Amino acid sequence: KAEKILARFNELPNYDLKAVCTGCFHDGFNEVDIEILNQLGIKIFDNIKETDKLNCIFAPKILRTEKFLKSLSFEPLKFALKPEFIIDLLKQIHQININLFDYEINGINESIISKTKLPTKVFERANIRCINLVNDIPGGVDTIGSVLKAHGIEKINVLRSKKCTFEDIIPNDVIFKYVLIVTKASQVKKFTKLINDRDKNETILIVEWNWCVESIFHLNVDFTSKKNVLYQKK
């Protein structure tokens, strides 16, 4: 059936896209439209799985979704495309000349895309390996945890803020000895006191989630930035 639609073409391009969409196409498209895409070397997965080797993300703009943030740890990310690509493509299909250059997500340039080829992840580069995350983090620890691990964090230790003792805090073993992601000033005070009582001479970094989000969008941890840093002892 799709084949009939595509019979009318002399030759089909192979876009070679393994994508997820975020902020778009939240189910699929009709079955014809989907079978066409695969014939054109475009495959769209529901969720991100490390062994499908995604290389593309469709999104209307830079977004703070789990999918968008994770797309920045593709190996590599090759294309970050507006949904208009698929739209224009199917419009034409229903010779094929839609191109991969007229549809860049504004703000995601080559310099950032190219960092996904680096042999390291952004937090791995920053020597942030094991962190502590407060249980009341917006988005919930499972998601935020999954994003952070996608970006080179190996251990995510969740802290019930109200309850936790110093012994619950894990060190960042790979440099900051203690790294914590927090929500409240009420938590900064508790944690600095605990650590400073028990491990006075050691270093501490306490940041907001937004600090991680900015690092991911830039694929760089900027340690000279005081934006989103709540406390540091170095």
Binding site: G23, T65, E66, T143, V213
Partner: peptide
């Protein structure tokens, strides 16, 4: 819908 963080 997908949660924005």
């Amino acid at each position: 819908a997908s949660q924005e963080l």
